[PDB]
Amino acid sequence: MTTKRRNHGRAKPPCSRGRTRPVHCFNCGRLAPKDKAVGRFVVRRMLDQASARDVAEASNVYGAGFPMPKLYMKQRFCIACAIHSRTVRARPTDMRKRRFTTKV
Amino acid sequence: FYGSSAAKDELVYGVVHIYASFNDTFVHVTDMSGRETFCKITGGMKVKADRDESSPYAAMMAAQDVVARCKECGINALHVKMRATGGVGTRSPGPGAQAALRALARAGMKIGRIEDVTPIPTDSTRRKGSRRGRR
Amino acid sequence: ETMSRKEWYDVVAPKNFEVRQFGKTICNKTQGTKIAADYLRGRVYESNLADLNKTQGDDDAYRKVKFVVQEVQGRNLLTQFHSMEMTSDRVYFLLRKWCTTIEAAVEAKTADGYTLRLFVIAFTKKQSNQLSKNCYAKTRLVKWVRHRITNLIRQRLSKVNINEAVTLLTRNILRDRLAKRCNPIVPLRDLRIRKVKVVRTPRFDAQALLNAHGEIP
Amino acid sequence: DQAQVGLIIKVLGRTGSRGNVTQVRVRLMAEEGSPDANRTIVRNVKGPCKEGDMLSLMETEREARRLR
RNA sequence: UUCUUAGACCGCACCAAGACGAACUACAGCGAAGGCAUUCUUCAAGGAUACCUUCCUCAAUCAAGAACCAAAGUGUGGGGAUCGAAGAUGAUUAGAGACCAUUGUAGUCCACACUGCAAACGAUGACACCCAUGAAUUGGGGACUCAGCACGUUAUCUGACUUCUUCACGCGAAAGCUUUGAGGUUACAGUCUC
């Protein structure tokens, strides 16, 4: 019916591909096309600040000695998935058209 | 004693595999070999009721009985390897991580050279779920 | 307990590491004709690189080293190379989206009958002046970089034995050359060895092993 | 029991939603210069609190809220 | 539900078998469409560009007719790790192979045959002309050792995909569409077809 979104909720432009590979979700296991799927990059700590202190005490070769590593992952979510944990939210008309590119 | 008597008055590096998931938390003991071990501790021994066997409290309560058995095995320093979950599971550990570490540090064990050792695929099989997901 | 029949040993490493006894390990007693020494052989013992060497622990404490047990002797354990591994996290630090990832594998056969898969990795680097959002490259500028890699590694290591070849990977003499030589083809950010896996082991020989440790402590 | 004083160093903020419980931070003045790397634990509190209030602690190494 | 002292879970080492190639992977590319992602080697192609080479109207679009065509299905043989319709068991519920959980057959893979049924969508038929604003990207062209090289910047051009979330005129019932048309149409006629 009505063209709600010009790009159709995709990063896939018309008249190019018409097919982009499916990708699983790290929530519910749902598949969707890669372009539709909602990418985020996490940078998840291996220790809270509160505990970081306590462990860096007992360390000598680590903590102070070398900066602590972090678990990195890419997270591709489904639409429904994203919305429900409210990391993507509905926006007014003027704002929906805005993009921030791939930068945070 | 039972432990060090030819490595005594010197630190000894164990290794500790920590596996944190949303049904239980495990704390294991290895000696930079992985071919021999001394103790296998599960959250579920210390705390009962399946929800609370993966909770932070489970971890810490278990961790103190790591330390108890390490000082009888001559182990003093502990390398640590944090593990999340399977390669057809998620990439997130449960809440029992970050609890265990602090409990050990505070209990006078040394901690150095922590690592992230987890099974992440180059690619693997179709993930459990459906096309339409769990719902 | 089970500690009634336990014992201890050490782990001796080659002379081309700067720490000989980096480990203190545990193994069951003979307990009849089962024989403790049998079990001890082919056991893998991991470490961190930066503890085991006192040189280039600055460059990486993000490398690990493994070994095997070729021969049990004394309370010692006489070992030889198994793998060297870059940690999972270290490559993410490097990695930037919008820069091409290159990789490659090389079968590198030494002077000895040992043989090594050398996995390699690399990434492209934007020029100092830039306006593009892309550091994307042509395909001829991919394979051509892999070309010099395979050449230069095979070349050197052919006439160099297993022992002294390990040294080049740990002290990262290889990496420096590789990163330098490839750079005019495409500016690289880093070039690294991801993983070093041992394929073929040719023999067990008392002499070569003993000599490769120098004098046992 | 253990009765271990601590001074409420500040009002950490509002956590919970019942109108009952607040989450506040406790600083240890119990220590005499004994090693603590904790060093100021967050504690959930029952009923009204105010800064500089001493209170006894039955527990230590509390991170309060956690992920749960 | 299910699995465990006949030692599970867990850790390390090694091996077997089958699928797949993460991240990097994009308001990017190639292909007529459907579609296509590890590396090396190999066979035959396709598009774009460059040219003071060649041919000289050989064209455009299409009833008839021919070829290709996602997934699920059917035939025969091989394979069968993972997931999984049907089935089984446990919950949830007033009722529940339900949605959920543990299992599990067909199927999921490959070869050779069929089927031609999709929101096969850009819901926009094909070819051709004219039509403005700004900033980028993708290829080519212009101003020792796979090496008289490769990348980048300034400027120009031809060919592709799209954005102005300051797209000009105009059109449309509005949403919207804009050299990339649904514009140049009651001042109604470029061409063909469904």
From Swiss-Prot, chain C:
Q: Which residues form the signal peptide?
A: none
**UniProt GO cellular component terms:** cytosolic small ribosomal subunit
Alphabetically list the UniProt keywords.
Cytoplasm, Ribonucleoprotein, Ribosomal protein
Which GO terms of the molecular function aspect are on file?
Answer: structural constituent of ribosome
Q: Does the keyword Ribonucleoprotein apply?
A: yes
Q: Which domain of life is it from?
A: Eukaryota
Q: Does the keyword Thylakoid apply?
A: no
Q: What is its main location?
A: cytoplasm
> Which locations, inside or outside the cell, does it occupy?
Cytoplasm
Its family remark reads: Belongs to the eukaryotic ribosomal protein eS1 family.
**Official protein name in the record:** Small ribosomal subunit protein eS1B
Organism from which the protein derives: Trypanosoma cruzi (strain CL Brener)
- Specify first residue, last residue and whole-protein length for the fragment: 22 to 238 of 261
